Amino acid sequence: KHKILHRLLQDSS
Amino acid sequence: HKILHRLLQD
Amino acid sequence: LALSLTADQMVSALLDAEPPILYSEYDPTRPFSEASMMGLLTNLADRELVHMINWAKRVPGFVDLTLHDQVHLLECAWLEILMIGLVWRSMEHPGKLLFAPNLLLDRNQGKCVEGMVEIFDMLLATSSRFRMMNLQGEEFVCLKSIILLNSGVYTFLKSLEEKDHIHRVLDKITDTLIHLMAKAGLTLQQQHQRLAQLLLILSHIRHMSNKGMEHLYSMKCKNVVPLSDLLLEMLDAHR
Amino acid sequence: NSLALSLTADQMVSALLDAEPPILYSEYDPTRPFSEASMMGLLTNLADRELVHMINWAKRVPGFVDLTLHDQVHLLECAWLEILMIGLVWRSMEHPGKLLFAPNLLLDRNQGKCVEGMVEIFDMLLATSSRFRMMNLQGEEFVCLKSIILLNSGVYTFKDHIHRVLDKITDTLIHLMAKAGLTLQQQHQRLAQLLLILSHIRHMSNKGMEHLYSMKCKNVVPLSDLLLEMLDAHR
Ligand SMILES: OCC[C@H]1CCCC(=C(c2ccc(O)cc2)c2ccc(O)cc2)C1
Ligand SMILES: OCC[C@H]1CCCC(=C(c2ccc(O)cc2)c2ccc(O)cc2)C1
């Protein structure tokens, strides 16, 4: 499923 | 004087 | 008196105060329903509460508190205490919760009650953690006493040497835990690590009690099970 | 094998300090007093922005990176409000009677009454802050506690790696206390005292989560999609 948390964790800086 | 209070006293 | 106790005396006092293991009124011939299972757990919990109240009075330092402070701590901690007791009894029964010796339930039976299986799963996982840790009876009674003294200590509403007294007893129980571990041959490092491991479980027990209390409240509302007079008052204390 | 286990205590402290998220501000509108809608609006907007930085922080907690995405997600979903709350409590330590949500958003309990059913939670938060203050909680101890929440709160609702990292953080907390000059007895007592406070923080998060859901249902504030998702994790 799509989660914003997925994107945030993957693009964490 | 609720139940717990009374039992704690008893 | 509580602060003049040696570690060994603290342990012997707590062990002696242990409540007995109660039986449920489970009739194995009676097919389960949501109502009867909730009925069984409520009936059991209600009888356990009377034993818990008299247990608490034997926890060193507890009777030094005002009656109103005693009432508050038990109101805050009662389900946490039932649950850690439950998790402890279930240690040697993987995949099952031993509510009573004649009432051993698995997660499948938990699904008899809407929304309860999620809580069963958390309890089972805690039991698994205890088993993996090889929790000792002496550590368990310390932990249960910590819950009683800690869980309500920041929701009281002058004195405050009453709270300071509670914190000193709490410290003595920490001293006792470390003593047990040192005696078991753990290094200093291992002692602090285990102490931390044990106290961190109390966060999960708080979590389960919180979720449990909400579930219980929804049961009272839905008129699924009639709660006892004591349980009603203990539940209303969280609202 | 995880790089985190090789870290010394001093290295653990350094890494955690360097990972600290920034202190965010609220809106600069000085209109007072707050309505229930205005207040929940400001808290929600702030929490939403804080959450983004929290993820960056979490990724820099030694050991977190070694976890699968799934496990990282589970821990953050479980612990996010605990983590916001321990941060709040820490920021408020030197402001007795007040909650420093932001440097330009310092609130007392009477302003908690602006929102139905929030003053009870405010009171718990204040009590915790007061506890940290009286214990003279150190920044180094704080970041250890906060990392412990991240790793511990969700760990029973999934393993060995996480527990080894948790053990390393315990070691670090003890090292800090020994370095501060505490006796061995004082060290284990303080460790216990701090870890017991995490149980209260869990309680507050659970109370808060029900309050939020209640606010979602009442449609008092539009919650952000991210917040909706974090909230929805608690079912
Ligand atoms: O319905 C709430 C969730 C449920 C989940 C399992 C543990 C638990 C129990 C429970 C827990 C431990 C125990 O020895 C005896 C009883 C319960 C307590 C009071 C009641 O009126 C009903 C049940 C709460
Ligand atoms: O409404 C729930 C009660 C409230 C009590 C104070 C702490 C808390 C916060 C909160 C806590 C810490 C923080 O830095 C920023 C925000 C909150 C979080 C998300 C929201 O959408 C709204 C608020 C929850």
Side-chain angles (χ1 to χ4, degrees), chain C residues 13-14 16-18 53-60 62-63:
Chain C
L14 291 180
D16 193 52
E18 270 298 273
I53 291 164
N54 286 267
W55 161 80
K57 300 160 117 166
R58 296 189 62 181
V59 172
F62 188 80
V63 297

Side-chain angles (χ1 to χ4, degrees), chain D residues 40 43-44 46-47 50 80-81 84-85 88 91 101 118 121-122 125 208 211-212 215 223 227:
Chain D
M40 292 302 309
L43 301 191
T44 296
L46 171 65
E50 283 187 280
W80 70 273
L81 183 56
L84 288 181
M85 284 178 171
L88 172 66
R91 299 195 296 280
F101 280 89
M118 196 172 60
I121 304 172
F122 266 38
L125 285 162
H211 193 255
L212 279 176
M215 207 247 245
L223 292 168
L227 266 172

Side-chain angles (χ1 to χ4, degrees), chain A residues 2-6 8-13, chain D residues 55-56 59-60 69 73 76-77 225-226 229:
Chain A
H2 180 109
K3 287 191 188 177
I4 300 177
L5 190 55
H6 291 166
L8 293 180
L9 282 170
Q10 286 172 339
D11 305 340
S12 65
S13 61
Chain D
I55 274 52
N56 285 346
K59 286 302 286 290
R60 302 175 99 112
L69 183 66
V73 169
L76 278 168
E77 286 183 343
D225 274 36
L226 174 67
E229 290 183 356

